[PDB]
Ligand binder design. Structure first.
Ligand SMILES: *[C@@H]1O[C@H](CO)[C@@H](O)[C@H](O)[C@H]1NC(C)=O
Ligand SMILES: *[C@@H]1O[C@H](CO)[C@@H](O)[C@H](O)[C@H]1NC(C)=O
Ligand SMILES: *[C@@H]1O[C@H](CO)[C@@H](O)[C@H](O)[C@H]1NC(C)=O
Ligand SMILES: *[C@@H]1O[C@H](CO)[C@@H](O)[C@H](O)[C@H]1NC(C)=O
Lengths: 116, 116, 116, 116
């Protein structure tokens, strides 16, 4: 059973803490990224359908030092060793002033998370 | 100022209904898709920094008919007419059984929403 | 039979010209984007497997006014009317100076193309 | 200066071989994947503007065992050791029959290449 609760570090050095996942898959936590360190809240859910041991999930980071938003989505795996590892991908939405600048406002990438 | 509360419709015919956005930008709603109609819940946050009139935003749909999870993120624009438009991009995470299948698990696309 | 040859305009006002697709799916052309107008070469291929009437395809734009690169990929459709329409998505790779800036160097979006 | 010519291997075990990059940055190669081994051709261009020692780049794989097309794009870095690394993101376009299925046709992911 891979669980989202606990403290995680990613391939980029950023860290996150997720609280308890409730009966409806809902969960909250904080995302911690850099020197001088900033915290931002995050909210999401974990898919509970078929009570999968490696469930999908998604979660929104409400950046508190910029006007941006990032969503992450992925799955909670247990690798060959028995270790919990979060494979995710994200869309970073930047704020743009004009709707004509919309096409360039969304970055994409990966983040792998292990337990800290 | 572009607000997320209300009922929204997108380019694919899917419809969604967002509740009130509290002072920390948090919000809940339901997402409605077909092909016939299933409803799943969604959670997310609207970015509040600088109180922008076209904020960015992002939200997770906890699909209740499948093991999948989708995140959207984008911005709440005002078009040339004065209408409210949501420009979003999404990641659809599918469930895979083995971590070695993770590479093929994430679909990407766009959605544009107007009000109902 | 949807064909990639010809001149196309997209939802963002940009225009492209594609030459003949040869027996190995290979094709070249020029991408034209804005006021003051710039041209950049593009090279790609069209999937020929099963000689599908609506084939997939991909193509790289070698930007000549920046250090960036954009790839597009999609499918050549014939909609209900009988009209050729190119549904595509793209990754815009920006140049970054340091490998530690890699995570933020890739934008994603959509472009729909019709005949000009 | 990071060059693309040679044989490359990525995080998934896939291997590729790129030929010479001519003065306009154009190049050809073959892409090798398994699960057993199929080879498909690839075409693309390396961005030449400002003759950067870590250029961006992008290339289309014309898969010859399926109706699909994948594009990659990224940058040719030099890591702290002095090694050459290709940091890429990709879009995998699947063939769909009806335009109404287009929304679910595009997968996204990452690949990191080192030399053979
Ligand atoms: C990650 O957590 C460790 C230990 O709690 C800490 O040393 C490090 O500074 C954290 N990273 C960030 C970006 O806060
Ligand atoms: C969208 O909402 C309208 C009424 O609010 C309804 O007619 C239609 O069926 C909805 N679309 C879907 C996919 O449920
Ligand atoms: C698109 O093509 C039309 C006609 O050839 C032209 O008026 C327009 O300027 C083109 N767009 C760009 C960005 O070059
Ligand atoms: C990678 O290349 C090596 C030799 O060049 C070979 O052993 C291996 O099978 C290749 N990988 C694939 C997936 O073909």
């Amino acid at each position: 059973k891979c669980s989202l609760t606990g403290k995680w570090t990613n391939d980029l050095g950023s860290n996150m803490t997720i609280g308890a996942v409730n009966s409806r898959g809902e969960f909250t936590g904080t995302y911690i990224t850099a020197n001088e360190i900033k915290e931002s809240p995050l909210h999401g859910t974990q898919n509970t359908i078929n009570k999968r041991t490696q469930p999908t999930f998604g979660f929104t980071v409400n950046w508190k030092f910029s006007e941006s938003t990032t969503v992450f989505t992925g799955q909670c795996f247990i690798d060959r060793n028995g270790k919990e590892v979060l494979k995710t991908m994200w869309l970073l939405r930047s704020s743009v002033n004009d709707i004509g600048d919309d096409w360039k406002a969304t970055r994409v990438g990966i983040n792998i998370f292990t337990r800290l």
